Design a protein around this nucleic acid. Structure first.
Length: 96
RNA sequence: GUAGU
């Protein structure tokens, strides 16, 4: 459909872990899992990742806040787009 | 080191 039962999280500090994110988002409702975009060329993440949920009612609750705060830095939370947007027509953070 | 593994 139009969205996954998962959020995008962008602007993450280099100090912030996948477990920091997974334990943080649990304040709104139950978290299924989390992942950050790791690069083996440096062993750091690409400054963004994803968080999967128990319910899309939490995905909405979290996305309505839009700007969150982790390790004394701010992060942007958005609905995870359905991977078709990884095409060169949408990979520049685009929408249909 | 803000649009995927």
């Amino acid at each position: 459909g139009s969205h996954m039962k998962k959020i995008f999280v962008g602007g993450l500090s280099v100090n912030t872990t996948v477990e920091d994110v997974k334990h943080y988002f649990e304040q709104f409702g139950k978290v299924d899992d989390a992942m950050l975009m790791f690069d083996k060329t440096t062993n750091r993440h690409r400054g963004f990742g994803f968080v999967t949920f128990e319910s899309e009612d939490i995905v909405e609750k979290v996305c309505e806040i839009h700007f969150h705060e982790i390790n004394n830095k701010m992060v942007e939370c958005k609905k995870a787009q359905p991977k078709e947007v990884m095409s060169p027509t949408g990979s520049a953070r685009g929408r249909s």
